[PDB]
Scaffold this active site. Sequence first.
Site, PDB file in Angstrom:
ATOM      1  CB  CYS A 102      -1.002  -0.107   1.145  1.00 44.99           C
ATOM      2  SG  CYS A 102      -0.276  -0.589   2.759  1.00 44.99           S
ATOM      3  CB  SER A 132       0.230  -4.355   3.152  1.00 47.13           C
ATOM      4  OG  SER A 132       0.412  -3.607   1.945  1.00 47.13           O
TER       5      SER A 132
END
EC number: 3.1.3.48
Length: 284
Positions: free
Chosen positions: A215, A222
């Site tokens: 991310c 994530s």
Amino acid sequence: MEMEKEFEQIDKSGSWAAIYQDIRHEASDFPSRVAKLPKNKNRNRYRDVSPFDHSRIKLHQEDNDYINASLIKMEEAQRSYILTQGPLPNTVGHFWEMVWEQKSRGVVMLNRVMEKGSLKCAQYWPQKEEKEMIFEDTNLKLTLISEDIKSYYTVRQLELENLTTQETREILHFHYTTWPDFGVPESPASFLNFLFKVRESGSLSPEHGPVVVHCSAGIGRSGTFCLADTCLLLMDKRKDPSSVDIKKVLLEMRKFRMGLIQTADQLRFSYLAVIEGAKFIMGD
Ligand SMILES: OC1CN(C(c2ccccc2)c2ccccc2)C1
């Protein structure tokens, strides 16, 4: 304790903030000395998000082997993930070097390039077939092969070429495009649909290197992705699924990268994703 009951108990008591802080307090603390070397300051997006030395991914070069990336190895589930930050303008070549060296099949992206009016990661893949990208620092070429745009996610086929040997590989890019700028999604349905599309691709399977997940910082969205995946997989693995403790799985994952799940709302959403994981699985 069955997690939908633990869930209703925390919701009725409004104690999400208190559970989340207990996790923060018990989480592992390991050294990140390589991340803090002065030569690596421009390789880190956020001063407070570093990979641990014991689990960091090493680039296969003698110059500087450093990237902000961690190997999460889940022994009982038999899954591995690499969690990394969104690449910076000066680390896009390092990013693709890592994908090449680790033999990854898939990249999972959980952010947009711009959110809240600011850049959250570099434009690290080509947007048009006929305009390929060359990374001169790592000697790689990246071409867009095809693009499939859906309402909640886009899937891209990419070709990565090692210009040194002229070997090529197909990389799948799974881009979740609808996580809101603030808070978490109201329903986990489109996130779970996305996760099932990554699984169906082969990207999470042991015949390939670990999937690369990011991310902006590579710890929040994530963290939610790998936590939900490992939880539902363990339900098919064990004789009693009721024994899967999401808080204990999260603390195990936090031995490998700091800060996974950044807010009490992400913790609640991850509980919800695993709970609502029921629908489109056992029961109905
Ligand atoms: O192949 C389908 C996946 N279903 C399981 C399953 C249940 C919850 C979460 C993930 C997976 C299952 C069904 C009934 C008894 C125990 C497990 C059966």
